[PDB]
Design a protein around this ligand. Structure first.
Ligand code: AGS
Ligand code: AGS
Ligand code: ADP
Ligand code: MG
Lengths: 568, 573, 91
């Protein structure tokens, strides 16, 4: 026949017990049996994003036909999995696909309506050459064929809803993606098959950790595909750890290994203030506020519909604004430059706002994405830095209203960007003169009140109502910026060790470097670039001059007005 | 058995020693054994490259099966390969190849989990059997995948996987991407040390280990079509057959690195490089002797080996007006270092003043004007990793370039918006500017070169970043030439004119007085050498081509370019 | 005309056949480099287009061959002119 060539008998495979114990999905099998028992249009199409187990639903339907959990219109049926990829194989000659397809339809008609057909990837029927829709389509309309289709939602609305006739011949049985507990029940149903295949043991905290962590930390796949992937890959890794040269129980540590590759952080976050003062000295209040935000987010108490950090940095520039934020992105998730910096001096127009959100449909910057939205859609776990937010056009803060209240922002191309795993940081200088001229012997709370009054005279009442906490950034004294210069000398010594040199200094040279470009009105960054220029010009010039040798004592001795490098 | 008819056994050929021993690739075989010992997504497909040992991993897996180094689950498994044209031997009837293949698949199902089948060129098996009223191979094996009756192992390229296996659904969810990286230089050394004894016992010659490491390094440096380690194996075996011919035709057996150089150039460095550099500069880039010394110092400090090899050699910002030898210097560096005239990339920064600067030049995330075209810089260096990079007219740049340029000036390697790494450590990055060129045209006369360079570096510190110009090797001052250098460059242009006329069949020698009339009538201090070019064109070629077509100047005579009162006339004698 | 390659292409991965191939670079890049079932049975002997002077030598030998057919006297300026002008003007 032609059914033997192109179809796979799923009820014969269920009779041989080769299918899976499909546990769950009972409403969708009831809905499919509601569609497969009509008089015309007996054709359910299963619809859901890939991985949600639609072939699993049809395998469960075949097992219920075998056992007898179906009504008296489905006992003794045969579920035959038709292969659309196997009929369009020899597509050379005229009328070579139509003879195959007509042979399958005549053999399904010979069985007197006793065969349910199953076409997975039903969108392959539309593009087959006219071809495959137009021959099935009269038999589908009159209920003479019981085609259980199965296709992805996006492929369905791209290929089948485009064609209103073939869309009429099918009924949508929406296969929704399962919850976390349902994945746990599936994996407890499928645990015995893996433990009798791999011949290992599986522990139930590893199962619930697989379901929870794949649900939480993977946005590509969907449950229960990714959870079964984690369990099977971990079981194979334990199988090769046994069978090479020693546990057999899969643990949640194995699940974390497979998730990270393919909870001492609590004790780290208890000393998160120490970690933030490892790299930025001074400014205890901002470190306390940011660490409070991190502790509230990681402890599970904060609002899950708001971003983690929503703060307004004030004060003069270069006092440790971006150094704190780079250290925060380093010790939060990954790295110093695993963050997003946006120079808000660029944005002073209306098309500036359309740049940082995205141009609407039909205009120039449409396909190019947004600016903020692309940077967060690429890095959903990152830190956002709005550098000098006072320079922005006064309607960027409406975009920021949506950002800081909801954690969502819809770009020009109509897709939502989730900000609920990031930290928004806005640096400004709206009260630099007022805090620099009144830093002396004034407290923190009244200074916050005064600069908050000034900022409230600057900003809109809706926007300052959204901010979580407004820190002050008091100016640093001479010893604070001197200690900053000491830390910069330490990281410069680290960079010289990376270059491969051991260079010492005198304390008089340290005082001259600390007093080259010291200015409280411009920050430590003029002092930083003064030290960096006055070291990287003469020392690296003497490197190119052929003087420095790796493995010699090099002291930064002082000149009358300069610093000389010696070779001892 | 139909297996004994037209299949190929790898375990038998590994047990009988007919297969090459495989050394290395333990991580890839380990991940392949991770993939094979699953219950879902059983079948691996080895995504690799044409010539990186995709067949070698399955050969080494068969050797570990025969040697018993495998885990207990894979012991006793007979790895077979599948041969197409062997199965299309005597099958011309109506469905005879399909019947033979169906019998092979029924015999593989009869083995019941015993045969781990290897299918090289898996996409080719998907698209093989263009038959007459019958089936192909891929859609007759495809029901045997999703019935648990096949333990396939595949091999393909990344592009053929992305086209022919990622597009399908069940073909995607039966297969795993065991990605096979291209091996390193020392990996190639280890592999060539593995198979040296077989080639020596075949070709009756001897192979030396410095020749092996030289073959590996020069194959990694020079050859771009093939890849490691197959190109190095081809070099070794081609040198072996060359030594065998030298025995046969007209008495050595030791393959040295000189033999490898003979084969490879047929397919002493630093000092001669310095001499050829400083000699071929004055052939092409005449004048600018301070610049010749500056470029010579830069090349000595680069190829001395005392600097950092994690940085690109080209790190330069240039100064001077149009037509001062900048492009001449770029093409001279290309013709010297890379053995080709057009061995460079010429892009001008005069038009990237907007936000489409990094996305046009460097690399575009999906949606830009430079996205459906490839890319201007990173994709061009993907085309030419052995080349020179030019950034002309840098005074019209954009601030989201300087960060990319600091990445080049610090580390060289560069990741564009698409997420691929393009390295610049074998390229020569060149930038040109013309801001301080007014003082150079103004007062180069009666002044020196060092104080001029210091004052124009002060002007750069007025205009540009003092920290961005630190990683630049040397910023040059291009000035001036009055009589003898004008005579030399006019002699160059006259040389190419003499080449065209001698291909026509004429012999023209310029007189000194006519060249003085060209130097007076063609040169001016305000412009440079372009009025010399158009004056050469007009005052020489237009009356000369007026005269040649006139039936006047007979071939084969010395044509002295004499002078008129103000013109330049050609004479016959 | 199964016709020839399914009785020859097996013998290439059988050692009984020692064939010598000749094809265009484009037909090689289409019909052989894709056909990876036979790729390590070949080596790309890239016959470069000859230069002008190699063509002049080829034309001197074939001058000696061609003058006995047309019964004329091909001249050596005609050889060097044909090489130079055919290299320039016929792309
Ligand atoms: N309710 C369920 N009971 C048992 N196994 C399930 C269930 N849902 C999913 N699975 C398993 O999850 C995996 C998903 O396979 P599929 O059914 O192909 O997934 P899908 O939802 O059909 O999406 P695609 O496009 O087919 S990958 C299989 O191994 C199924 O056995
Ligand atoms: N410094 C120089 N020394 C000697 N000859 C020079 C010098 N600068 C220019 N020339 C000559 O003048 C010509 C001017 O052409 P180019 O240098 O190519 O002009 P350009 O400014 O580089 O722009 P293009 O795109 O190359 S036309 C050169 O080809 C040389 O023949
Ligand atoms: N480590 C190795 N040990 C033995 N042989 C090797 C090794 N690496 C490469 N080879 C040889 O180089 C060839 C290249 O293999 P492969 O990349 O599979 O070619 P292709 O990609 O064209 O199928 C192999 O046939 C093998 O004989
Ligand atoms: Mg499916």
């Amino acid at each position: 026949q032609a059914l033997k060539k192109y179809t796979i008998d799923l009820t014969e495979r269920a009779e041989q017990g080769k299918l899976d114990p499909v546990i769950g999905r009972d409403e969708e099998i009831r809905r499919t049996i509601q569609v497969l028992q009509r008089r015309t249009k007996n054709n359910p199409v299963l619809i859901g994003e890939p991985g949600v187990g639609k072939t699993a639903i049809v395998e469960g339907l075949a097992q219920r036909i075998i056992n007898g959990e179906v009504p008296e219109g489905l006992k003794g049926r045969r579920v035959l999995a038709l292969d659309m990829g196997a009929l369009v194989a020899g597509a050379k000659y005229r009328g070579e696909f139509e003879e195959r397809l007509k042979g399958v339809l005549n053999d399904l008609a010979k069985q007197e309506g006793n065969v349910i057909l199953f076409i997975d990837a039903l969108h392959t029927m539309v593009g087959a050459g006219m071809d495959a829709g137009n021959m099935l389509k009269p038999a589908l309309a009159r209920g003479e064929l019981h085609c259980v289709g199965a296709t992805t939602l996006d492929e369905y609305r791209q290929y089948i809803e485009k064609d209103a006739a073939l869309e009429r011949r099918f009924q949508k049985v929406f296969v929704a993606e399962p919850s976390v507990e349902d994945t746990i029940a599936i994996l407890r149903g499928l645990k015995e098959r893996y433990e009798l295949h791999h011949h290992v043991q599986i522990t139930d905290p590893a199962i619930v950790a697989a379901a929870t962590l794949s649900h939480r930390y993977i946005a590509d796949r969907q449950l229960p595909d990714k959870a079964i992937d984690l369990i099977d890959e971990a079981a194979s890794s334990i199988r090769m750890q046994i069978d090479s040269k020693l546990r057999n129980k899969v643990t949640d540590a194995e699940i974390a290994e497979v998730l990270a590759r393919w909870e001492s952080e609590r004790e780290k976050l208890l000393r998160m203030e120490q970690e933030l003062h490892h790299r930025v000295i001074g400014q205890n209040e901002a470190v306390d506020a940011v660490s409070n935000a991190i502790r509230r987010s990681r402890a599970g108490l904060a609002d899950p519909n708001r971003p983690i950090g929503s703060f307004l940095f004030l004060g003069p520039t270069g006092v440790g604004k971006t150094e704190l934020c780079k250290a925060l992105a380093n010790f939060m998730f990954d790295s110093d430059e695993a963050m997003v910096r946006i120079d808000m001096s660029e944005f002073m127009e209306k098309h500036s706002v359309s740049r940082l959100v995205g141009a609407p449909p039909g205009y120039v910057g449409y396909e190019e994405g947004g600016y903020l939205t692309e940077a967060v859609r690429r890095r959903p776990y990152s830190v956002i830095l709005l550098d000098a937010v006072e320079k922005a056009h006064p309607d960027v803060f409406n975009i920021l209203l949506q950002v800081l209240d909801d954690g969502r922002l819809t770009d020009g191309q109509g897709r939502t960007v989730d900000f609920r795993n990031t930290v928004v940081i806005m640096t400004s200088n709206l009260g630099s003169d007022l805090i620099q001229e009144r830093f002396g012997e004034l407290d923190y709370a009244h200074m916050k009140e005064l600069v908050l009054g000034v900022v409230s005279h600057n900003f809109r009442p809706e926007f300052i109502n959204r901010i979580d906490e407004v820190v002050v950034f008091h100016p640093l004294g001479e010893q604070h910026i001197a200690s900053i210069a000491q830390i910069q000398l330490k990281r410069l010594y680290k960079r010289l060790e990376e270059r491969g040199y051991e260079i010492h200094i005198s304390d008089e040279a340290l005082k001259l470097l600390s007093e080259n470009g010291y200015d409280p009105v411009y920050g430590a960054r003029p002092l930083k670039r003064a030290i960096q220029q006055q070291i990287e010009n003469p020392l690296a010039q003497q490197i190119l001059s052929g003087e420095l040798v790796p493995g010699k004592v090099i002291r930064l001795e002082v000149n009358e007005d300069r610093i000389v490098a010696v070779q001892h």
